[model samples]
Target: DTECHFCKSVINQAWNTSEQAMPQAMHQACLRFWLDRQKCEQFVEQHMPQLLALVPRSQDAHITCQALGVCEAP
Candidate 1:
């Protein structure tokens, strides 16, 4: 869903709307770009439930799952 600057702004603001907003919310490409930079599981355990609960179903399942994992395969 993320595209350009406007989308990036939305993704950034997403955290304000819901604290669980993932880097993926900003841009899947962007998230993937920084995939190796942090602890995925920690981000997930800390944010998943709240994020999924806020977003509609049939959205980014990968975000939900990866955000909940210890890490992911490159």
Candidate 2:
């Protein structure tokens, strides 16, 4: 079973994919929170080739983590 790097819980169904050091799994909500906190879109563009490979260069849809309610609303 894959475990989320952020939440330390088993990933059951859906997961966000990333290649950080090694392959890492995260809940989509968990990844969204991490992205907002890190503000690392530019980093992804420049350094995270694997992520860009998956997404391609493009405009990102805005996602509001608080409104989603998967994590604590802030």
Candidate 3:
């Protein structure tokens, strides 16, 4: 249901093959869609305190998301 039409890339294939490792191409729109729906905020909420302490004092909370093609909902 989520092939990236803008880039002609397949999405949501999690097999460990090279094709899955790197999607053939990426659509910026698709990538943004995934990032906007990601749970990074929740993860940061749970781990931020510890992560901040371990990293650097000046290093603040900046969570970036990268497109991993996509994932089928479990």
Candidate 4:
């Protein structure tokens, strides 16, 4: 699909989507925001603390994506 992957829109020409973590075709603006927004973290990220600490940004970014609700095992 030509979904923007980030903004979820139609992809226009003269753009990039290859560098995406997934092969989702996107607008240049979409790509730009994706890279830019990556710096914004959420415990919503992944539960992998190893990569969390090893990567940039705050290591304690591991809190409460679990709080937003749903898909949890009791």
Candidate 5:
């Protein structure tokens, strides 16, 4: 079981292969949540480029936030 850096849980299996040297893992749902909160894309893109390609930009943020238990469903 892989631990999610965002939620600190053992449910995430996806990780950034490009940054394998540093080794970071995050849930797709959590990545979606993070993207939703961002005001700009460049920041995240520069830091975690893989996430931009991994998580779809059109995903429903409300559903993702609820699934990750970060907030109540809208």
Candidate 6:
């Protein structure tokens, strides 16, 4: 857990959120893997693009996840 659990790297200074100090959280990406394991890989591959389109860019993470119906309130 010392290393960042989810990292795609950065462009700017590391701006930290207070909520990040809490470890009682799940990565949406990780959640997808866990959920996806039970389903067909092709299902996600073909459906994800359209599902992703349900939420526009430049939006709230919480709102976007629920918009796709893939996540609950965090």
Q: List lDDT for all candidates, in order.
A: 0.45, 0.34, 0.31, 0.29, 0.41, 0.37
lDDT of 3: 0.31
Model number with the top lDDT? 1
Model 5 Cα shift for residue 11 (angstroms): 18
Give the poorly placed runs of model 4, Cα more than 4 Å off.
Answer: 1-46, 58-74
Residue range 1-74, candidate 4, lDDT tens digits: 11222222212111223223222323333446656545323321453355324432211111221232321322
Instruction: Count the clashes in each prediction.
Output: 2, 0, 0, 0, 0, 0
Maximum-TM-score candidate = 1
Assess the local accuracy of residue 73 in candidate 3 as a C-alpha lDDT between 0 and 100: 26
The segments of candidate 2 whose C-alpha lies over 4 angstroms from its true place after superposition are 1-31, 53-74
Which 10 successive residues of model 5 have the least lDDT summed?
1-10
Quickly count the clashes in candidate 3: 0
Q: Would you estimate the TM-scores of all the predictions?
A: 0.23, 0.20, 0.21, 0.15, 0.21, 0.22
Error of 4 at 38 (Å): 21
lDDT, candidate 5, 33-67, per-residue tens: 67653533434446555654555221344345457
Better model by TM-score: candidate 5 vs candidate 6: 6
Ranking by lDDT: 1, 5, 6, 2, 3, 4
Lowest lDDT sum, 10 consecutive residues, model 4, at: 57-66
All candidates: CA RMSD in angstroms? 16.2, 15.1, 18.6, 15.6, 13.9, 14.9
State the displacement of the C-alpha of residue 15, model 3, in Å, after optimal TM-score superposition.
38
True-vs-predicted CA distance for residue 72, candidate 2, Å = 56
| Backbone clashes (count) for model 6 | 0
Q: How do the residues 1-74 of candidate 1 rate in per-residue lDDT, one tens digit apiece?
A: 22333443544455454444443563444356657445554565464566546653323433443454522422
User: Which whole-number lDDT from 0 to 100 does residue 42 have in model 1?
Assistant: 52
Over the stretch 1-74, how does candidate 3's per-residue lDDT look in tens digits?
33333222222222225333222222233345556424544444453455334432111111111243432222
Per-residue alpha-carbon lDDT of candidate 2 for residues 1-74, written as tens digits (9 for 90 to 100): 12122232212112223223222333343356676635444444455566536641111111222233333422
TM-score pick, better of 2 and 5: 5
lDDT of 3 at 2: 38
Residue range 1-74, candidate 6, lDDT tens digits: 21221221110113234224222123345345666543445444454555545432322443444555544554
Roughly what TM-score does model 4 have, to 2 decimal places?
0.15
